[PDB]
Paper text:
Here we report a prefusion-specific nanobody against gB that is neutralizing with cross-species activity. We determined full-length high-resolution cryo electron microscopy (cryo-EM) structures of gB in its prefusion and postfusion conformation and describe the nanobody epitope and mode of neutralization.
By mutational stabilization we solved the herpes simplex virus 1 gB full-length prefusion structure, which allowed the bound epitope to be determined. We resolved the prefusion structure of stabilized gB at an overall resolution of 2.74 Å whereas the nanobody-bound structure reached 3 Å. Notably, in both structures, the resolution of membrane-embedded domains is substantially lower than the ectodomain, which indicates an intrinsic flexibility of these regions even in the stabilized protein. The previously unresolved N-terminal region encompassing residues 90–106 forms a helix that is held in the groove between domain I (DI) and domain II (DII) of the preceding protomer that is formed by repositioning of a short loop region (amino acids 407–410) in the connection between β20 and αB33 in DII. By contrast, in prefusion HSV-1 gB, the three beta strands (β4, β5 and β11) are significantly (four to six residues) shorter. Fusion loop I therefore changes its length from four to 15 residues and ‘rolls up’, forming a short (2 turn 310) helix while keeping contact with the MPR by positioning W174, F175, Y179, F182 and M183 towards the hydrophobic cleft of the MPR. The region containing fusion loop II also diverges from the postfusion conformation starting with residue D251 and forming a 310 helix (S257–Y265) that is stacked on top of the helix formed by fusion loop I. F262 of fusion loop II is thereby nested in a hydrophobic pocket, created by residues I185, L252 and residues L686 and Y689 (DV) of the adjacent protomer.
Numbering used by the authors:
A (entry chain C): 202 to 475, 501 to 603
B (entry chain A): 554 to 804
C (entry chain B): 704 to 804
Write the structure that this text describes.
Amino acid sequence: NAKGVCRSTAKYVRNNLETTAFHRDDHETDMELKPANAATRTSRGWHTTDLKYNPSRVEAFHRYGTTVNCIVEEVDARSVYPYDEFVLATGDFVYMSPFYGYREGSHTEHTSYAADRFKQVDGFYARDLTTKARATAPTTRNLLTTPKFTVAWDWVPKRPSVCTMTKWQEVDEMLRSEYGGSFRFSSDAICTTFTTNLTEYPLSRVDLGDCIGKDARDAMDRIFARRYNATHIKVGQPQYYLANGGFLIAYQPLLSNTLAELYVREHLREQSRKIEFARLQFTYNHIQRPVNDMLGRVAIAWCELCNHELTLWNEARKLNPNAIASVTVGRRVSARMLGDVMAVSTCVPVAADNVIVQNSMRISSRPGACYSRPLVS
Amino acid sequence: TVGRRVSARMLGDVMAVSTCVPVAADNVIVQNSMRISSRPGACYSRPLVSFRYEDQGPLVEGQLGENNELRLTRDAIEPCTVGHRRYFTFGGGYVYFEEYAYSHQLSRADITTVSTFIDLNITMLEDHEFVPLEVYTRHEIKDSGLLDYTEVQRRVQLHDLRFADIDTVIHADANAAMFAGLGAFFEGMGDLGRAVGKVVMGIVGGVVSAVSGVSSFMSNPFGALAVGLLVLAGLAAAFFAFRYVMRLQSN
Amino acid sequence: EVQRRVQLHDLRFADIDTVIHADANAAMFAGLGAFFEGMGDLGRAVGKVVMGIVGGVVSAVSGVSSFMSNPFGALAVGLLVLAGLAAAFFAFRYVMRLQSN
């Protein structure tokens, strides 16, 4: 931080004992940190020795008795609730809360490293290794030593709380049926089938802030006004259910005008020989049988269609991961198959005038070979 | 198409089919390592397993295939890489391996799902590689996951280049450089160049063919033995006669 | 199956590369190196000169091997040994006459 240099010496372990290394077998010296040429605009990096890029590495390791190279790298970091640990853009984990420290409220957070491995600094000032210029305002700096690298970040107090659940999908049409002592839900919009117990969940016992309830009511009314107001009727008040896998479903049953009148004429005959549709919806067997057949056929049609599309899409995913992932996310991304799952990251853009193409694809050193695609700078 | 697990194979322009047999999840065991001990450069592509068809039956050996399939061959092998990481589907969950060794198991609920053809809520990072030093010092190959269609055709084009370089070496021979050197010298001398070159090329051809003949004879064990016995006899005769004349030289 | 075979072929090329990049003397140098490192200071004092003389031996053998591969090089030694055999057997038969009488 003070000058942009390292000591040219290090401690290492071999044969179960500690030993000291020295750059090219020479004495302790301040080595200058140089920018990495292939590093992006963001996620910058610096090194003390050029062997990572220069071809001299083919002989350098046989030319000197020992080498020492100092590395410094900027990376993105992410943490998720309950914020007990975090990950780095290199794929490594850190078993400590990003909000931890010695200040108020920070010292009670989760940690898995010894007390000597952590240190905090107040009134710290950053300095860019590229420009050699110092920062204008101070920060609080956290420092931690992992068994394979040291890591540092700027400290901030723990952010406020938020609603326990977030809206994922608004479904215009969703069929519900009862089978094997459980409810089953399905739609053409999503290929998932939700399964749930018959008992309704008491949402009011937990959503005291109405953050789930209010949003649900508004969405159901928007959908009803847009598509159903002219052809269907609301049967009763909304219902809440907790589906397998950790989803919460807000449901609103409907009846079409053409079907509602069948319940009306049955009720009129029942009243003649001797309205809350919620009391009648499943009582008249002769009306429900045609409905079970009609809607059962619709549900099966959607099920067969999902299997057809998933089968084609999952095969294309193996041939070209980048194209398939970019279409799903809606932006250019890089993707790779790590066995039976996919890993992803973001690509960085470059302006069209900052690119130059070379005139030849032939390799001069080996006459039989040629490049498949053009060379660029 | 059929609505159940089946095995299929393409016999040219038609398909052949048969039924698969199920095995219970508790009758299967996975091994801790993917490295091959007999040949240090090779590693298995997918984990090794052991299982039983019935709760009391003898053990059978295999390799874990795609989508819970149990293969009986143990033939998926690759050259070992650095920075290896993999997740394999296993009995309704996943098993995690790193640097060709086992680590732990996960539930299908532990990983986020791209549950729709389009979804924008993913919170990615700009990844930065923490490359191992062996890539520079020992020139070891860095892992790159499963091959895609572009990568497959890139490797096929690289292998046919290597075979082409081998063909050039066996089709050509060391005398071609000599013949080219001689020809380049003679063509520049005109009529005299051809008048001398035509006879010089003939005698040089006689030399290389004669040398090739005697060299070829030694390929046979009896040919190699005959020349070996001749030089051995010559050595015995030489040292005996040399020692004998040394006696005369002495007195 | 296609990607399984592609990975099997690149394993075979890696084994071929390993054989041509390495050489028979590496095993000898490794054996010598392990002995001299284990021998300590005196081991280094001897090893530094031993690698020089062994280098002279292997380079001399390679030097003649590079000559022997040429048709004229093979012919030159062939004519020399043939002449040596003729000289040896003639001289042996000659002294045998003297040995007889």
